[PDB]
């Protein structure tokens, strides 16, 4: 199917110390594969997945240099932004950048991303045409004009269309049996007696990958949306995910209600109920 590479970068100011903390995490298909943390004793991009382990020292030094330069770039931009927003001295401030590429199921570039948040709020984003910028506010307009002048979008487009795609291809092959594989949800229902004449059908999806999933509860045939409790899809820690969906039900009416699980790994949607 389709695939994606994302680098998520964060620089955070804090009252007190000369230089802010810079972190970069790389994901192939929303599975962590590299990390850089300026706090670590020996700051460097490190492998966060076994298949990435077979890149050589030159790979690691070149990517590290990019992180070190990014650190400098975020440091300067943090200060530039202080002035743009007429923020005084100190405060805690944050700058986020997301970037990368989506491929289709044919492995060709579907969409490129290059975008920034200041203080958790959209600042500037490279448009989908990969040539023009959307600027969230007047401050961002300054940046936009600046980057229009320097032709920075051309730089970004070249990375997005070229390097990003070309190396995502290399990673998809190298870690073949992890990224291009799916793990389907193991599904089951636990039962929890409640107040008067009310039990609680919780329906579990465990151990799936990727993270996108959907759970519904049905009675007689009409999907139940209200009355129902959902939890946010959560990492199990081992590369997989969990979710559950629960509902209110009277005693006796267990074999009426049915949970459905919708996941890419399934040959088809999944149906189930309480099993005494």
């Amino acid at each position: 199917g389709p695939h994606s590479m994302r680098y998520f970068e964060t620089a955070v100011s804090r009252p007190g110390l000369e230089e802010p903390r810079y972190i970069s995490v790389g994901y192939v298909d929303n599975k962590e594969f590299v990390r850089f943390d300026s706090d670590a004793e020996n700051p460097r991009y490190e492998p966060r997945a076994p298949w990435m382990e077979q890149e050589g020292p030159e790979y690691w030094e070149r990517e590290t240099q990019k992180a070190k330069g990014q650190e400098q770039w975020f440091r300067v931009s943090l200060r530039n932004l202080l002035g743009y927003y007429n923020q005084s001295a100190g405060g805690s401030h944050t700058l986020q950048q997301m970037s990368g590429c989506d491929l289709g199921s044919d492995w060709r570039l579907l969409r490129g991303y290059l975008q920034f948040a200041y203080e958790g709020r959209d600042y500037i984003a490279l448009n989908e045409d990969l040539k023009t910028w959307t600027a969230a506010d007047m401050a961002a307009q300054i940046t936009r004009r600046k980057w229009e002048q320097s032709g920075a979008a051309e730089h970004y487009k070249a990375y997005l269309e070229g390097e990003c795609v070309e190396w995502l291809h290399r990673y998809l092959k190298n870690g073949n049996a992890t990224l291009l594989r799916t793990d389907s949800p193991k599904a089951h229902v636990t039962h929890h007696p409640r107040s008067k004449g009310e039990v609680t059908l919780r329906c579990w999806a465990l151990g799936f990958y990727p993270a996108d999933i959907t759970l519904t509860w049905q009675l007689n045939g009409e999907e139940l949306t209200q009355d129902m409790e959902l939890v946010e899809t959560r990492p199990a820690g081992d590369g997989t995910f969990q979710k559950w969906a629960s509902v209110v039900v009277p005693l006796g009416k267990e074999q009426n209600y049915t949970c459905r699980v919708y996941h890419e790994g399934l040959p088809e949607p999944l149906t189930l109920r309480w099993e005494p």
């Binding site: 743009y84 600046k146 390097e163």
Partner: peptide, 9 residues
């Protein structure tokens, strides 16, 4: 492989 920025904010 990671992007890198050029012109600052």
């Amino acid at each position: 492989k990671a992007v890198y920025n050029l012109a600052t904010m």
